[model samples]
Target chain A: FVNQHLCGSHLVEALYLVCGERGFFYTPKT
Target chain B: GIVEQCCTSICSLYQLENYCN
Candidate 1:
């Protein structure tokens, strides 16, 4: 479940970048 | 898996922040 969720969130960030926006917050999962 | 994730995140930051090689 954690792996899937993390991948999904990364995908969301990837898509966000694909749209040309470059500002993002980075929070490491503990 | 964790290391891979960290590398990916760092690379993403590199890309986003316009870091040059």
Candidate 2:
């Protein structure tokens, strides 16, 4: 896909936001 | 599953803010 997702700082921010809430249920899968 | 949902929401929000693009 052509630029389907975010990139650079925007992507970083998005990733951070996602990771923050992931703690409630999501975690590193073994 | 939840994260993906959030991203889509955030993405839509962004686009929506872009004059509902």
Candidate 3:
């Protein structure tokens, strides 16, 4: 989170060079 | 009949590069 979490135009380009997988996943609530 | 509510907030921080390669 930053100064705000819902602010529009908030571009979060986090580059993890140490990350093994190219992407991520999560469980969605039903 | 049992329904539980787990309400909590977690704050985390991170650092990354500017541009995409």
Best by TM-score: 2
lDDT of candidate 3 over A1-30, digit per residue (tens):
332121112122222231224542211222
Query: What DockQ, between 0 and 1, does each candidate earn?
Result: 0.07, 0.06, 0.10
Give the per-residue lDDT of model 3 (tens digit) for B1-21: 000111122212231222222
- Per candidate, native contacts kept equal 0.00, 0.00, 0.07
Q: Per-residue CA lDDT of candidate 1, range A1-30, in tens? A: 022222445644653554455544443344
Model 1 docking tier (incorrect/acceptable/medium/high): incorrect
Clashes of each: 0, 0, 0
Tens-place lDDT digits, model 2, residues A1-30: 012344444644544554454322321212
What would the TM-scores of all predictions be?
Answer: 0.26, 0.31, 0.19
Off by over 4 Å in 3: A1-21, B1-8, B11-21
Pick the winner on TM-score between candidates 2 and 3. 2
Real A-B contacts recovered, model 3:
0.07
Interface RMSD computed for candidate 1 is what? 10.2
